[PDB]
Structure 1
Amino acid sequence: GWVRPDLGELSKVTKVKTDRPLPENPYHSRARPEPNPEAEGDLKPAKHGSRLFFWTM
């Protein structure tokens, strides 16, 4: 009681239930490094202008 699978019939990706738990860390990766310190705040004018040598502004 078997049939020859059609062309491409035994090629589509299927699904299957497995009672095993999910591999939460397949690569066994460590703790990821923390990001750079996030910065925020509106741009207030630079204090005393350029502040480069004698330039007032």
Structure 2
Amino acid sequence: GWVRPDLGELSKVTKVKTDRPLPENPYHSRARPEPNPEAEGDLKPAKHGSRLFFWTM
């Protein structure tokens, strides 16, 4: 009572109804480093100009 599978069906991407739950982290990843805080605030003008030696502005 079987049947020869034609081309394609055996290569079909098929789902499977399982029991085992999704692993929490298969790669066994560790805790991430905290990213450095990003810049915030209105870009105010530079205080007292270039401030490079005697250059006033």
Q: TM-score band, normalised by the shorter chain?
A: over 0.9
Aligned length: 57
Report the aligned-residue RMSD: 0.8
Q: Structure 1 residue 22: deviation in Å?
A: 0.8
The one-character-per-residue Cα deviations of 1:22-56 (angstroms, maximum 9, x if unpaired) are 11110111001111112211111100000000000
Q: Which runs of 4+ in 1 moved over 3 A?
A: none
Q: TM-score normalised to the size of structure 1? A: 0.92
Distance 1:30 1:52 in 2: 46
Unaligned runs of 5+ in 1: none
Whose helix fraction is larger, Structure 1's or Structure 2's? 1
Q: TM-score normalised to the size of structure 2? A: 0.92
Unaligned runs of 5+ in 2: none
